[PDB]
Amino acid sequence: AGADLPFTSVEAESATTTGTKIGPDYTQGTLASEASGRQAVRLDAGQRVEFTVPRAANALTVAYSVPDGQSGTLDVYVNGTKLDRSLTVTSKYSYVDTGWIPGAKTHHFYDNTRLLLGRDVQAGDTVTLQATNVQVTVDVADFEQVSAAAGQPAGSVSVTDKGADPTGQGDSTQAFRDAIAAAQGGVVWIPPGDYRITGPLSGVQNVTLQGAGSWYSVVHSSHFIDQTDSAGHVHLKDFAVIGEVTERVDSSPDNFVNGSLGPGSSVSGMWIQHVKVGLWLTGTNDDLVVENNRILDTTADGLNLNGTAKNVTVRDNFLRNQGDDALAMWSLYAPDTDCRFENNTITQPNLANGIAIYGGTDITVKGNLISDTNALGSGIAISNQKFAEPFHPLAGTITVDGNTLVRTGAINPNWNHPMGALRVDSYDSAIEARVDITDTTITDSPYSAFEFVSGGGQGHAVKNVTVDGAAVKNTGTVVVQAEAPGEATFRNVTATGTGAAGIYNCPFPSGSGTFTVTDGGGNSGWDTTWSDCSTWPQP
């Protein structure tokens, strides 16, 4: 499961250090709770963490936190020799409050900082991070092989020929606009450099915007593309869009893409960071492919298909440190139809879900690796929670296949009751789609594995659900947390290390009916039921 990625992560807590390990802790609002693996290494200015390089690499991304209000640098050594550049570390993009979200606490403590090494280290080499001028809590480091900067394709129109400033001083918005107009049906080239784009660009259609690689062609914008419609055939490729967003303003489109890329479009090879939402997509995006991107450090969702999406594929992306659902489909206005989230890797959404499907028709969630979620969500949520109107509830077949969910689920502070790793939630209406949950690996869940709930207390049925094939290991409470009326069939679910019981079956509200668990065969390790519905299984 997960994205096919040209990098390998090494947890700081698995490296050799003179600092202090923090965690594990799942408690909402703690520094350790937002760390990958629930653990990190605090480095005083004393102290270093020495990583053994896991693979050939020439680039480094580090997830870290520094105290709010402070900033500094983190030195890098390779084989005991100090590199001549350091990582910039700051709290500027961290420590986000969302008081309007009930139950949310201050969050978003970490950030990601990157550096080309100027060297190509190899497996067995040592990369050491040394704190010098600020206390740095290091979570995890990614070791990547980044290709050399690509050359300009023949016939493309360079933004610098239209007046763009690759030193990042002047505003390049008009130059990009002029290049797009001059390269209709063709390619706009973004040479290596830093480009300030106050933005937004609109009328982006019939054009490829291509950089030399997301480590070389860097756009600095907090409002890059914003348009309600487009003729489509837009291809965004191989550049970075890095904003300066430090808060979540729901009414402000402080996003990389806001609106419509039109039909037949694609987004690939991008590095998207320090925005509110990476891609807030509405309207016509038929057949859009969003693939092989990194979306890091966003104060809200990584990507949301907010209605009308048709045959959109989001695949092979890496998402870390989103401020809400990392990937979401919200079928307002018109159903998202035949869309798929496939083979993505998601870690540490600060609140809410790894993947959330709210309504929609014939949706696939396949092959994703989702780790370390927090209060207010699940690893995967398949949901009829509407939030607003006009909403289109789940319809057709929802295919949830081949996903791996690691340390997902959390106590919701609004109930003091937990959300499970994977939930089906008949929040505002009964499940009228078929929901097929197959070949799921659920590992080290702090609470329950599978949850079936009508989360608003309205008593709508969770039904038409089949769970077929699962490897469930080290579940804190129950394999099945059944709190909605309805029915589901379970086959081929193998559980080990279940903390409390196989099944908790206690539907609410009283008066809304029973939930029938059908044992379809092949199940093992969870053949017990929690005896007392008036109590809660504890981890």
Ligand SMILES: [Ca+2]
């Ligand atoms: Ca960690």
